Amino acid sequence: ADQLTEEQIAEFKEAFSLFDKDGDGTITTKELGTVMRSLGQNPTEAELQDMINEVDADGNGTIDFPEFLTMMARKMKDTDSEEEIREAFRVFDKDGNGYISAAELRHVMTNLGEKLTDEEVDEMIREADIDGDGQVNYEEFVQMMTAK
Amino acid sequence: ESWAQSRDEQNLLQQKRIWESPLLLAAKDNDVQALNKLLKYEDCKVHQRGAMGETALHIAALYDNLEAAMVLMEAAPELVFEPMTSELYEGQTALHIAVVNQNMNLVRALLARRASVSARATGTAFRRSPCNLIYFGEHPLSFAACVNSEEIVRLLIEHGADIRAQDSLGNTVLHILILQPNKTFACQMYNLLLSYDRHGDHLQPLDLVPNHQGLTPFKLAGVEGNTVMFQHLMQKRKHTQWTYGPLTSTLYDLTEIDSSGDEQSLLELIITTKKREARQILDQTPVKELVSLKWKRYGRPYFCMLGAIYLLYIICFTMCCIYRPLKPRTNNRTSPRDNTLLQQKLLQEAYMTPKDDIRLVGELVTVIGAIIILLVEVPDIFRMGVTRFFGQTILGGPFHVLIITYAFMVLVTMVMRLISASGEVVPMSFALVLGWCNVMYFARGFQMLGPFTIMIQKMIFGDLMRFCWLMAVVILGFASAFYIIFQTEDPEELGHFYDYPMALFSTFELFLTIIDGPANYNVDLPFMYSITYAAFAIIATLLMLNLLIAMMGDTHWRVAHERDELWRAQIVATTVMLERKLPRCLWPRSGICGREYGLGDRWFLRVEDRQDLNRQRIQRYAQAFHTSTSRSSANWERLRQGTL
Amino acid sequence: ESWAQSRDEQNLLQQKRIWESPLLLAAKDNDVQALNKLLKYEDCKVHQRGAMGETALHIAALYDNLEAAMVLMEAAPELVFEPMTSELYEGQTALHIAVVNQNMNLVRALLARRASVSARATGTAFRRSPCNLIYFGEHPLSFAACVNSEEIVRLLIEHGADIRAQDSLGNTVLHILILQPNKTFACQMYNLLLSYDRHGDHLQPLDLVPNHQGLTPFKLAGVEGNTVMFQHLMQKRKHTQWTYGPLTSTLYDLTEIDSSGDEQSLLELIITTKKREARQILDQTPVKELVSLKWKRYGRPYFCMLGAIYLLYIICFTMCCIYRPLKPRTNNRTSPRDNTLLQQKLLQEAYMTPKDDIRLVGELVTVIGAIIILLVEVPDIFRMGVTRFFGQTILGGPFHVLIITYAFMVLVTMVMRLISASGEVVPMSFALVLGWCNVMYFARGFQMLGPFTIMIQKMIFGDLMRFCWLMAVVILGFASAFYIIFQTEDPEELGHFYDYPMALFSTFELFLTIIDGPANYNVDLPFMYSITYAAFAIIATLLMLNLLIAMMGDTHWRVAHERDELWRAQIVATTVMLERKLPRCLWPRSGICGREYGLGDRWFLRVEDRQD
Numbered sequence A: 001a002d003q004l005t006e007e008q009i010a011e012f013k014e015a016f017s018l019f020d021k022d023g024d025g026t027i028t029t030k031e032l033g034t035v036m037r038s039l040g041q042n043p044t045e046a047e048l049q050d051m052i053n054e055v056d057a058d059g060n061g062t063i064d065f066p067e068f069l070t071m072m073a074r075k076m077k078d079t080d081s082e083e084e085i086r087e088a089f090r091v092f093d094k095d096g097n098g099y100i101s102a103a104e105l106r107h108v109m110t111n112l113g114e115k116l117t118d119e120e121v122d123e124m125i126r127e128a129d130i131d132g133d134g135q136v137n138y139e140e141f142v143q144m145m146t147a148k
Numbered sequence B: 001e002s003w004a005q006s007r008d009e010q011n012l013l014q015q016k017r018i019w020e021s022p023l024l025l026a027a028k029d030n031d032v033q034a035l036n037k038l039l040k041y042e043d044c045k046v047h048q049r050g051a052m053g054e055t056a057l058h059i060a061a062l063y064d065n066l067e068a069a070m071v072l073m074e075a076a077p078e079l080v081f082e083p084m085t086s087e088l089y090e091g092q093t094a095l096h097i098a099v100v101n102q103n104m105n106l107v108r109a110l111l112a113r114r115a116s117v118s119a120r121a122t123g124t125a126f127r128r129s130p131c132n133l134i135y136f137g138e139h140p141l142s143f144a145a146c147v148n149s150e151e152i153v154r155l156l157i158e159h160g161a162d163i164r165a166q167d168s169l170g171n172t173v174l175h176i177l178i179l180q181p182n183k184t185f186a187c188q189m190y191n192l193l194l195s196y197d198r199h200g201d202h203l204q205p206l207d208l209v210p211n212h213q214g215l216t217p218f219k220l221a222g223v224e225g226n227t228v229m230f231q232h233l234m235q236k237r238k239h240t241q242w243t244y245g246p247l248t249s250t251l252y253d254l255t256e257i258d259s260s261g262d263e264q265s266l267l268e269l270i271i272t273t274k275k276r277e278a279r280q281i282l283d284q285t286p287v288k289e290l291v292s293l294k295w296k297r298y299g300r301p302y303f304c305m306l307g308a309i310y311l312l313y314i315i316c317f318t319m320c321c322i323y324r325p326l327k328p329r330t331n332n333r334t335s336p337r338d339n340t341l342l343q344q345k346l347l348q349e350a351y352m353t354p355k356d357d358i359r360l361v362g363e364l365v366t367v368i369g370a371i372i373i374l375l376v377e378v379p380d381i382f383r384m385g386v387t388r389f390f391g392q393t394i395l396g397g398p399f400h401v402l403i404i405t406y407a408f409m410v411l412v413t414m415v416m417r418l419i420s421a422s423g424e425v426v427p428m429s430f431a432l433v434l435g436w437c438n439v440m441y442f443a444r445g446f447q448m449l450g451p452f453t454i455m456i457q458k459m460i461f462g463d464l465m466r467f468c469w470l471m472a473v474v475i476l477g478f479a480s481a482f483y484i485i486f487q488t489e490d491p492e493e494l495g496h497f498y499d500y501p502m503a504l505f506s507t508f509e510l511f512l513t514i515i516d517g518p519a520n521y522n523v524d525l526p527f528m529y530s531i532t533y534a535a536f537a538i539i540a541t542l543l544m545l546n547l548l549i550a551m552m553g554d555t556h557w558r559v560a561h562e563r564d565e566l567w568r569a570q571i572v573a574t575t576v577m578l579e580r581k582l583p584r585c586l587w588p589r590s591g592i593c594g595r596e597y598g599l600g601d602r603w604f605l606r607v608e609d610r611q612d613l614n615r616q617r618i619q620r621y622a623q624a625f626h627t628s629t630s631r632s633s634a635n636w637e638r639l640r641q642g643t644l
Numbered sequence C: 001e002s003w004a005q006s007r008d009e010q011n012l013l014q015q016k017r018i019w020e021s022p023l024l025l026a027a028k029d030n031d032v033q034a035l036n037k038l039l040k041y042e043d044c045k046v047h048q049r050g051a052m053g054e055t056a057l058h059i060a061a062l063y064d065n066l067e068a069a070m071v072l073m074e075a076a077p078e079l080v081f082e083p084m085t086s087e088l089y090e091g092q093t094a095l096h097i098a099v100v101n102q103n104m105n106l107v108r109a110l111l112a113r114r115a116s117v118s119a120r121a122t123g124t125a126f127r128r129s130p131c132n133l134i135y136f137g138e139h140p141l142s143f144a145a146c147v148n149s150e151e152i153v154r155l156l157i158e159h160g161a162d163i164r165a166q167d168s169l170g171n172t173v174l175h176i177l178i179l180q181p182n183k184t185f186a187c188q189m190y191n192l193l194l195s196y197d198r199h200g201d202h203l204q205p206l207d208l209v210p211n212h213q214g215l216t217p218f219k220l221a222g223v224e225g226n227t228v229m230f231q232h233l234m235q236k237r238k239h240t241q242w243t244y245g246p247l248t249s250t251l252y253d254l255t256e257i258d259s260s261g262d263e264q265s266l267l268e269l270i271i272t273t274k275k276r277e278a279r280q281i282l283d284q285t286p287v288k289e290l291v292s293l294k295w296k297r298y299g300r301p302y303f304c305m306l307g308a309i310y311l312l313y314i315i316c317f318t319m320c321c322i323y324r325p326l327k328p329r330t331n332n333r334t335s336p337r338d339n340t341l342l343q344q345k346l347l348q349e350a351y352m353t354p355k356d357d358i359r360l361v362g363e364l365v366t367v368i369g370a371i372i373i374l375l376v377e378v379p380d381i382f383r384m385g386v387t388r389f390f391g392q393t394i395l396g397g398p399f400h401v402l403i404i405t406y407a408f409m410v411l412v413t414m415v416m417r418l419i420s421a422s423g424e425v426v427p428m429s430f431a432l433v434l435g436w437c438n439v440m441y442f443a444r445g446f447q448m449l450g451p452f453t454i455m456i457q458k459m460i461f462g463d464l465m466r467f468c469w470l471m472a473v474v475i476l477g478f479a480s481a482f483y484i485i486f487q488t489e490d491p492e493e494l495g496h497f498y499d500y501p502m503a504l505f506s507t508f509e510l511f512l513t514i515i516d517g518p519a520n521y522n523v524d525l526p527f528m529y530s531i532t533y534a535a536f537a538i539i540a541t542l543l544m545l546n547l548l549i550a551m552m553g554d555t556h557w558r559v560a561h562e563r564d565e566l567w568r569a570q571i572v573a574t575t576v577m578l579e580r581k582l583p584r585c586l587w588p589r590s591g592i593c594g595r596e597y598g599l600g601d602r603w604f605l606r607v608e609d610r611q612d
């Protein structure tokens, strides 16, 4: 939705992915039904019908990725980050997946001395790991800068 | 080197021709008042050129002047055509410049003037080279897809672009999106460009046509190391069979990954390319499970049978060198009687006893083994290459050379035995240290010995080679210094330095501290000697041999996750080699076939896994729909200080 | 290996049988219109099977089709029963699938159709194996408790589940919650499942019944390394006596932790298990103070008395090997007179002087000491095991072997002395280097020497073993190369390489740079020699011996907090060993008893602390 940077699309792409558990680009009422039951909720069949039909511009009946990207730019929370942090993250992230890893904080720390054990690398991860996948986001990376 | 000198002279000359022309300078800034005064004249040179062979419309499009460019199109509509005629920017039209500058009004104005959407920017400044900072393509659709403008791509298709535009490299539009430095936004365009295909029957859909190297867009992401594009192209090639709670069972398609491959398949492309970013595709979702099922099942047992045949081969060669024929010395000791100790020599008619008939069997095992090496290795060197890319396959490297040099030195010994030449000690004593140190090849199939044999190689071509240039500086200076000190004295009470070849071999050993050091304690040594040897032992033993341990110790923890990535790529290179050379009676093809399961003729590999259940993530995106610690936090401040 | 090949062929065959059946394919997608057309026919095969032996209701529950599943229950109510009859998913009913998919409407619809809540999913795809990705249990209550659905657990109890359902492993519901990978949400379910017990008199409450290994839910958290579940189960076993400002005095219960333990107690379970995550329970709140009170009071003095008895034992054995009997050479030197230097030999009737009567006392101290070793160590090897799990107790490891091999080599020397055999040098010279290097066992009770003896062990089975495979490659190549160079020459001016066993022993020493290097400087050495020895000394001394120091130096700072966790577990293994073998007259039982304080018959340990 052409206001979104490189790291947000990479966050929203896998965010689209764990909804879509059949390996395509279509959110039917089924897959959003499988999510909302796993949240412990009882999904109303009208509620499942409304939430798909509310954001579906093409009218096919399945939410694809550009419509999930359009919806998420509406319901974006906010971010007001810095130039120095964003340029730091794009150099730190090497393959460009939008994520710094445990394999990619070893490279940054070896770049400035700083002998870490592989345990202490993962001990750095879990402090910045707000949600949890064993990876630090861009939103979590900003959080570990402007804390002071 | 002189081309960049010539290219800089072109850009300064272009700025000269603009200032020395009243049309081009007025089209440069904006000067909409000045164009109406010039273009109303009779001969106002509308087809004027420059250093890049550009017109006034190329200038107005390059410096982003919408107002001046429309005046040029009104007074002369022929300038929408007629691209640049220089060698550098050959073929680049004015539509190309408006697209790269990502202008929306100037592109739509040019398309109303019947611009060519199928022109080719086939200059030397658009080709894929390390000299150029960009590789955008040749066509306007290729330019709009790489600067990430979805408005102009949709605009160019509606005015009749070609979705299958191929370059001089043969690359389509989808190949160029992979070669771009912004991986995430290339994925967004890749879905868009396939969406407008949708009628590409052609007996070739869209993303299956290769370039002039035979690479599809799927395999080009494999070679160039686009980890982001590789995971995006996996969405088409998997099928979720069933989801049983926190347990899914996907079904990957091994039709472009598995090296059954009469064509060139993806495991050969990754393992032979020189990039260090392509070896990260060996950890992805179908490829990591494919290699392990080849290596555990059929890769490791066949590699440990070749490790045991070769080990019994190099024992059979060793006992032919121990029991080799010798006779006592024939004529005399009379070579000058103070420096000769050899007392046996080589025999001519060796095979005349029953104990040598056993050895003749053992030598024919060796020589036949030396021919078989030169028939399975040399017809890959002279055939697949003219030795241009044989050196570093992955980093595996020397074991091609050590097995050729072994098979050469056995056959030199065959020649010297048949013609009964004198010195067979020289071709043998190479052939043993080349022979047994090639057993280190078979230490890549064991995790204990695997990553250690890589660190031996990364020191010899590195932290040991740069030490042996500054060792040969030192032991040429001191060995020529110690030689002239003991040159004027007695060479039997201390004879470490009597010849200059011997003085080089003493000081090589005194640098290594493997022999003791010249001391007699009965006769007065030269007074200059004790000064120049105490100078020597400080910068040999106290300084420079304690600076290898400080340098190899510094390197060993820096490349300590690279050598683990190098070992997992040595298994893939071994597995593909064992799969290719062995027959099809052994080594069954990987994955389950699909003939008797209603899936076609291709080959599948299913992987099931337990993923998670992460509540805090899934609850945050769900509402959006609606109608040990102490020294870790010390490390982040160390990163905040480094970032600042 | 071929089982996973066979299991993949089962899943592809199941997708074949669905597509090749009009009922199963229609039940797969949703096709509620298509079911009414088929099921109104006469013989529409309601008990149709597949590859997993599933029905149409198993398919509709697996792909989460509530609408199609109710149509199957209306047209055929018998399909709520009749579980899968394959070997892999044996016994799994349709209620099991609706619970694991965490469907709320399909479960409640099945319970109205009188579903079996006490069925058993006793297939080979639900058993606790490394092949399976899940271990959920066998019962529907076990399935709902592991996918974290408190709605379905409350729903299953109201329809008559069994709270004491045991598997084929014997595990109850509370045992399965410990084996789950999400520790925090397992604690939330553990309080819920005990809350609905509340009438479990039974002479066994709920969380005291063991599985088929004798482990309670408290001790199973101790073995499996659930640090989160272990701290949650400590809430039941403590009592806060008084709170005086910033100072509380709790009272832990040592009835399932302390190794008085005629049963198998928790300090033996942790110290013998192979997991490296169970050794983190040795730092928790009752266990860290329990070990220190055993080790400081009665553990260290009894370990330093055994360190002084053994040290005076191995001095008494050493002086029997120094003063051992020898007589001068009997017959002749006439073995070939250029290579013989031995000039004494062993005596037969040694004990005929008063100075040897002292040694006979010293040898009977040794041999009796060698029997006592084989009576306190061998009846634990042949009895508690058939040598299946003797090797790595914790990582302690070789000192079992070095004390058996010592007691064997003393008794070989006893046999050779009685039958008057020839070579007693060979059984002795093993028995001394085995004997004195076993004093390194007693360096685990000293913090100065403790963590250093572990790093000696983690190099020998590691960074020294992988170097000695690539050392024997090199000194077979060069020693066979140096041998053939000096094979044609004079073996007395430079005789480092005259035999092939001697050429292997020279090049082993030239690799280590412990002997100097072949150089004569009076006679012309072979021209090939100076080339092949300069090649040798670079890749022996300059490359590979400086690559041990770079490799042992890289390892020593990586495992530098693991060897400190290994040392604190070597004290616990020593303490439990000293507690077991010593009698009860020594070593008083830890903690304060509760008979004369009105607390029962169990044993308590109070810990006070200042918190914050």
Ligand SMILES: CC(C)CCC[C@@H](C)[C@H]1CC[C@H]2[C@@H]3CC=C4C[C@@H](OC(=O)CCC(=O)O)CC[C@]4(C)[C@H]3CC[C@]12C
Pocket (backbone or CB within 6 Å): B306, B309, B310, B313, B365, B366, B368, B369, B372, B373, B376, B377, B393, B394, B395, B396, B397, B398, B399, B400, B401, B403, B441
């Ligand atoms: C006469 C009788 C005893 C049979 C003896 C046959 C084997 C002892 C030889 C014959 C051909 C040899 C093979 C020829 C070619 C290769 C490929 C070669 O590949 C590399 O060097 C890859 C690493 C790199 O890139 O350097 C490794 C050794 C190997 C497997 C050789 C292993 C030993 C083999 C099987």
Ligand SMILES: CC(C)CCC[C@@H](C)[C@H]1CC[C@H]2[C@@H]3CC=C4C[C@@H](OC(=O)CCC(=O)O)CC[C@]4(C)[C@H]3CC[C@]12C
Pocket (backbone or CB within 6 Å): B524, B525, B526, B527, B528, B529, B530, B531, B534
């Ligand atoms: C940076 C260095 C100085 C480290 C400090 C070590 C010193 C204590 C060493 C290094 C140089 C040595 C000197 C080097 C040269 C000589 C001359 C040497 O010659 C003689 O007077 C005797 C003749 C002979 O030895 O042949 C005697 C030892 C001596 C004084 C050495 C004595 C010990 C010295 C001063």
Ligand SMILES: CC(C)CCC[C@@H](C)[C@H]1CC[C@H]2[C@@H]3CC=C4C[C@@H](OC(=O)CCC(=O)O)CC[C@]4(C)[C@H]3CC[C@]12C
Pocket (backbone or CB within 6 Å): C306, C309, C310, C313, C365, C366, C368, C369, C372, C373, C376, C377, C393, C394, C395, C396, C397, C398, C399, C400, C401, C403, C441
């Ligand atoms: C005539 C007299 C002097 C007899 C000699 C008695 C002692 C010198 C011997 C007899 C029994 C021995 C003990 C038998 C068993 C053990 C356990 C043993 O433990 C292990 O093997 C280590 C455990 C692991 O592998 O981690 C260490 C030696 C020790 C204490 C021995 C120490 C020396 C002892 C006390």
Ligand SMILES: CC(C)CCC[C@@H](C)[C@H]1CC[C@H]2[C@@H]3CC=C4C[C@@H](OC(=O)CCC(=O)O)CC[C@]4(C)[C@H]3CC[C@]12C
Pocket (backbone or CB within 6 Å): C465, C468, C469, C471, C472, C475, C501, C502, C504, C505, C508
């Ligand atoms: C112990 C492991 C982990 C290290 C690697 C093994 C080899 C690299 C070393 C260690 C043991 C050594 C062997 C130990 C015993 C002997 C017997 C001995 O042979 C003799 O009898 C000749 C010498 C003599 O008689 O004095 C010396 C060579 C040899 C084969 C040694 C050769 C080098 C070996 C094989």
Ligand SMILES: CC(C)CCC[C@@H](C)[C@H]1CC[C@H]2[C@@H]3CC=C4C[C@@H](OC(=O)CCC(=O)O)CC[C@]4(C)[C@H]3CC[C@]12C
Pocket (backbone or CB within 6 Å): B468, B469, B471, B472, B475, B499, B501, B502, B504, B505, B508, C527, C530, C531, C534, C535
């Ligand atoms: C990896 C290396 C090249 C780093 C630098 C070390 C060199 C300076 C060394 C390594 C090999 C050495 C050579 C190995 C073999 C010989 C033969 C030998 O000469 C003889 O024939 C004997 C002496 C005599 O003639 O009396 C000793 C000198 C020489 C040239 C050595 C001279 C010093 C060399 C070139």
Ligand SMILES: CC(C)CCC[C@@H](C)[C@H]1CC[C@H]2[C@@H]3CC=C4C[C@@H](O)CC[C@]4(C)[C@H]3CC[C@]12C
Pocket (backbone or CB within 6 Å): B396, B397, B398, B399, B429, B430, B433, B434, B437, B440, B453, B454, B456, B457, B460, C531, C532, C535, C539
């Ligand atoms: C001059 C003659 C006598 C012997 C010379 C020995 C040299 C040429 C040989 C013997 C030992 C060999 C090395 C042994 C080990 C390794 C590590 C491996 O990962 C790559 C090959 C490499 C790096 C070899 C390169 C070539 C080598 C250095």
Ligand SMILES: CC(C)CCC[C@@H](C)[C@H]1CC[C@H]2[C@@H]3CC=C4C[C@@H](O)CC[C@]4(C)[C@H]3CC[C@]12C
Pocket (backbone or CB within 6 Å): C396, C397, C398, C399, C402, C429, C430, C433, C434, C437, C440, C453, C454, C456, C457, C460
């Ligand atoms: C061949 C004969 C003569 C020599 C016998 C040497 C062997 C049996 C002995 C000598 C020294 C011993 C080692 C000494 C130190 C340690 C570290 C310790 O934490 C575990 C045992 C361990 C790893 C021992 C293992 C066995 C050992 C290697």
Ligand SMILES: [Ca+2]
Pocket (backbone or CB within 6 Å): A020, A021, A022, A024, A026, A027, A028, A031
């Ligand atoms: Ca879907």
Ligand SMILES: [Ca+2]
Pocket (backbone or CB within 6 Å): A056, A057, A058, A059, A060, A061, A062, A063, A064, A067
């Ligand atoms: Ca849509």
Ligand SMILES: [Ca+2]
Pocket (backbone or CB within 6 Å): A093, A094, A095, A096, A097, A098, A099, A100, A101, A104
């Ligand atoms: Ca990354």
Ligand SMILES: [Ca+2]
Pocket (backbone or CB within 6 Å): A129, A130, A131, A132, A133, A134, A135, A136, A137, A140
């Ligand atoms: Ca994260």
Ligand SMILES: [Ca+2]
Pocket (backbone or CB within 6 Å): B515, B516, C515, C516
């Ligand atoms: Ca020395």
